[PDB]
């Protein structure tokens, strides 16, 4: 009897697509409404696009990092719980039941 796993990984199942689509929409807006007449505008839009690309890349990578760390901690916690139960099995007498 437990809730659905979808709500546990809320930082990867929900909050990543939000920001990814937001950033892509901003990039499309910039590219579409860039007007070719002004050299300063074009030069600015260049680095805007490049920056948004770098941002979305790093935003993707950070989640991989966090997820690897979480998996490691999970397996360690499983080992610890098993050892703790095995240990506490022997001290059944002290606990008054």
């Amino acid at each position: 009897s437990d809730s659905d796993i979808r709500y546990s990984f809320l930082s990867t199942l929900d909050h990543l697509p939000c920001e990814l689509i937001r950033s892509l929409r901003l990039m499309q807006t910039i590219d579409l409404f860039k007007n070719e007449e002004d050299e300063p505008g074009m030069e600015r839009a260049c680095r805007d696009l490049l920056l948004v690309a770098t941002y979305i890349n790093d935003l993707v990578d950070d989640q991989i990092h966090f997820l690897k760390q979480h998996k490691k901690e999970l397996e360690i916690q499983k080992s610890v719980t098993k050892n703790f139960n095995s240990s506490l099995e022997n001290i059944k007498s002290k606990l008054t039941l």
Partner: protein, 93 residues
């Protein structure tokens, strides 16, 4: 200088070739990425079938169906993000 002119034109042609190749590769890769769904549900037995972007609670065993191979063209959220792509889309349709 016509020499500088042709020196610019050659690199221009190479650059537009690379750009078109990148566009096509992104297109096909995203098609495969959105279509890969059915293989895991049809063949451990990780019944979780469904992507992360378009995926919803079908990315959980609460649902069971085999129509997961349905996807339209308004979901190419990685190729839509360019101006040339949407202009060509609206031109051809």
């Amino acid at each position: 200088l016509k020499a500088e002119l042709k020196k610019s034109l050659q690199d221009r042609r190479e650059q537009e070739d690379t750009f078109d190749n990148l566009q096509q590769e992104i297109y096909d890769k995203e098609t495969e990425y959105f279509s890969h769904n059915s293989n895991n549900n049809h063949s451990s037995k990780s019944h979780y079938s469904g992507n992360i972007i378009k995926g919803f609670d079908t990315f959980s065993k609460s649902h069971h169906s085999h129509a997961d191979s349905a996807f339209n063209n308004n979901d190419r959220i990685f190729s839509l993000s360019s101006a040339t792509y949407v202009k060509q889309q609206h031109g051809q349709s």
